[PDB]
Design an enzyme around this catalytic site. Sequence first.
Site, PDB file in Angstrom:
ATOM      1  CG  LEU A 191      -1.970   1.417   1.135  1.00 14.92           C
ATOM      2  CD1 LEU A 191      -3.066   0.877   0.430  1.00 14.92           C
ATOM      3  CD2 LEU A 191      -2.439   1.593   2.575  1.00 14.92           C
TER       4      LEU A 191
ATOM      5  CG  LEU B   9       3.758  11.931   1.418  1.00 13.10           C
ATOM      6  CD1 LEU B   9       2.302  11.382   2.249  1.00 13.10           C
ATOM      7  CD2 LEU B   9       3.914  11.401  -0.054  1.00 13.10           C
TER       8      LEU B   9
ATOM      9  CD1 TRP C 254       0.765  14.344  -1.788  1.00 17.71           C
ATOM     10  CD2 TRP C 254       2.674  14.341  -3.365  1.00 17.71           C
ATOM     11  NE1 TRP C 254       1.069  12.841  -2.182  1.00 17.71           N
ATOM     12  CE2 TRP C 254       2.260  13.172  -2.986  1.00 17.71           C
ATOM     13  CE3 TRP C 254       3.935  14.263  -4.216  1.00 17.71           C
ATOM     14  CZ2 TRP C 254       2.935  11.604  -3.732  1.00 17.71           C
ATOM     15  CZ3 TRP C 254       4.231  13.158  -4.658  1.00 17.71           C
ATOM     16  CH2 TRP C 254       4.113  11.938  -4.295  1.00 17.71           C
TER      17      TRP C 254
ATOM     18  CG  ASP D 232      -3.700   8.513  -0.213  1.00 17.33           C
ATOM     19  OD1 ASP D 232      -3.695   7.758   0.663  1.00 17.33           O
ATOM     20  OD2 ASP D 232      -3.361   8.074  -1.420  1.00 17.33           O
ATOM     21  CG  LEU D 233      -3.359  11.691   5.206  1.00 17.98           C
ATOM     22  CD1 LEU D 233      -3.164  13.298   5.599  1.00 17.98           C
ATOM     23  CD2 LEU D 233      -2.769  11.048   6.001  1.00 17.98           C
TER      24      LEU D 233
ATOM     25  CG  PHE E 274      -2.688   5.333   5.851  1.00 15.59           C
ATOM     26  CD1 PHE E 274      -1.839   4.460   5.192  1.00 15.59           C
ATOM     27  CD2 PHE E 274      -2.299   5.426   7.121  1.00 15.59           C
ATOM     28  CE1 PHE E 274      -0.809   3.525   5.774  1.00 15.59           C
ATOM     29  CE2 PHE E 274      -1.315   4.625   8.080  1.00 15.59           C
ATOM     30  CZ  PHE E 274      -0.280   3.833   7.120  1.00 15.59           C
TER      31      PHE E 274
ATOM     32  CG  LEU F 258       0.399   5.869  13.739  1.00 18.52           C
ATOM     33  CD1 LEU F 258       0.573   5.637  12.417  1.00 18.52           C
ATOM     34  CD2 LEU F 258      -0.642   7.097  13.842  1.00 18.52           C
TER      35      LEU F 258
ATOM     36  CG  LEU G  81       2.438  -8.071   7.464  1.00 18.69           C
ATOM     37  CD1 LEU G  81       2.153  -8.250   8.841  1.00 18.69           C
ATOM     38  CD2 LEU G  81       3.620  -8.701   6.947  1.00 18.69           C
TER      39      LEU G  81
ATOM     40  CB  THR H 113      -2.945   6.496  -4.252  1.00 18.80           C
ATOM     41  OG1 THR H 113      -3.181   5.626  -3.206  1.00 18.80           O
ATOM     42  CG2 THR H 113      -4.330   7.455  -4.507  1.00 18.80           C
TER      43      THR H 113
HETATM   44  C1  LIG Z   1       3.859   9.874   6.198  1.00 11.24           C
HETATM   45  N1  LIG Z   1       2.680   8.612   6.238  1.00 11.24           N
HETATM   46  C2  LIG Z   1       2.704   7.365   5.510  1.00 11.24           C
HETATM   47  C3  LIG Z   1       1.763   7.282   4.333  1.00 11.24           C
HETATM   48  C4  LIG Z   1       1.366   8.681   3.649  1.00 11.24           C
HETATM   49  N2  LIG Z   1       0.435   8.354   2.766  1.00 11.24           N
HETATM   50  C5  LIG Z   1       0.090   7.128   2.234  1.00 11.24           C
HETATM   51  N3  LIG Z   1      -0.844   6.967   1.238  1.00 11.24           N
HETATM   52  C6  LIG Z   1      -1.021   5.661   0.633  1.00 11.24           C
HETATM   53  N4  LIG Z   1      -1.984   5.555  -0.355  1.00 11.24           N
HETATM   54  N5  LIG Z   1      -0.870   4.590   1.234  1.00 11.24           N
HETATM   55  C7  LIG Z   1       0.360   4.801   2.375  1.00 11.24           C
HETATM   56  N6  LIG Z   1       0.779   3.562   2.989  1.00 11.24           N
HETATM   57  C8  LIG Z   1       0.620   5.812   2.897  1.00 11.24           C
HETATM   58  N7  LIG Z   1       1.505   6.112   3.845  1.00 11.24           N
HETATM   59  C9  LIG Z   1       1.306   8.964   7.104  1.00 11.24           C
HETATM   60  C10 LIG Z   1       1.065  10.143   7.228  1.00 11.24           C
HETATM   61  C11 LIG Z   1      -0.183  10.437   8.048  1.00 11.24           C
HETATM   62  C12 LIG Z   1      -0.868   9.245   8.816  1.00 11.24           C
HETATM   63  C13 LIG Z   1      -1.889   9.463   9.630  1.00 11.24           C
HETATM   64  O1  LIG Z   1      -2.156  10.265  10.240  1.00 11.24           O
HETATM   65  N8  LIG Z   1      -2.769   8.390   9.453  1.00 11.24           N
HETATM   66  C14 LIG Z   1      -4.042   8.534  10.413  1.00 11.24           C
HETATM   67  C15 LIG Z   1      -5.032   9.410   9.621  1.00 11.24           C
HETATM   68  C16 LIG Z   1      -6.221   9.876  10.752  1.00 11.24           C
HETATM   69  C17 LIG Z   1      -6.715  11.378  10.288  1.00 11.24           C
HETATM   70  O2  LIG Z   1      -6.811  11.522   9.100  1.00 11.24           O
HETATM   71  O3  LIG Z   1      -6.531  12.357  11.091  1.00 11.24           O
HETATM   72  C18 LIG Z   1      -4.762   7.152  10.658  1.00 11.24           C
HETATM   73  O4  LIG Z   1      -5.469   6.976  11.811  1.00 11.24           O
HETATM   74  O5  LIG Z   1      -4.274   6.163  10.015  1.00 11.24           O
HETATM   75  C19 LIG Z   1      -0.067   8.072   8.382  1.00 11.24           C
HETATM   76  C20 LIG Z   1       0.873   7.649   7.860  1.00 11.24           C
END
Ligand SMILES: CN(Cc1cnc2nc(N)nc(N)c2n1)c1ccc(C(=O)N[C@@H](CCC(=O)O)C(=O)O)cc1
Length: 162
Positions: free
Chosen positions: A4, A19, A21, A26-27, A30, A54, A94, A116
């Site tokens: 992913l 990142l 951008w 996308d967040l 995830f 997390l 996983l 994506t």
């Molecule tokens: C830097 N990073 C890694 C990251 C970023 N974009 C991605 N985009 C995709 N498509 N796939 C990934 N594995 C991916 N990974 C990040 C950045 C932010 C969060 C994050 O805050 N995630 C929260 C989002 C909660 C919120 O939106 O507030 C969650 O609960 O998973 C996770 C990974």
Amino acid sequence: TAFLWAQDRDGLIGKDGHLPWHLPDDLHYFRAQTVGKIMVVGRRTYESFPKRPLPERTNVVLTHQEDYQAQGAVVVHDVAAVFAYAKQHPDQELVIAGGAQIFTAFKDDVDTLLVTRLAGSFEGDTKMIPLNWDDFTKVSSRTVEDTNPALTHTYEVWQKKA
Ligand SMILES: CN(Cc1cnc2nc(N)nc(N)c2n1)c1ccc(C(=O)N[C@@H](CCC(=O)O)C(=O)O)cc1
């Protein structure tokens, strides 16, 4: 095992660990592809997060160091260790997020490839490894536009033929 990651028309998938951008849309995907399952991140991706560890899902950090510490996250340094931890949970999967060093470790164990594809171009040094898209097939594909034309993204789901 489930890959992913997010990249653009250039193939970049990040910059200096963070990142380049910002695709808030996308967040939201995830969080849905991690909560309830097991998340797999390396050391460069673990520190890349703002709030650590997390919550909402298990944390799996994999690095080549034997002196790391994390109250709440799991510290492992063996491929079989991450596999035994995932096998212990039958209602979990996983998910490989990154970085590229972690993707190379799980190269001989992946059937689904979630990615994506964006539309706007960007500059950075982090790129995606060379994968083979000839031995795979796309069955799911949803295009999603954002406020701007450069922040366009499309969720693609590739799967192995057999
Ligand atoms: C830097 N990073 C890694 C990251 C970023 N974009 C991605 N985009 C995709 N498509 N796939 C990934 N594995 C991916 N990974 C990040 C950045 C932010 C969060 C994050 O805050 N995630 C929260 C989002 C909660 C919120 O939106 O507030 C969650 O609960 O998973 C996770 C990974």
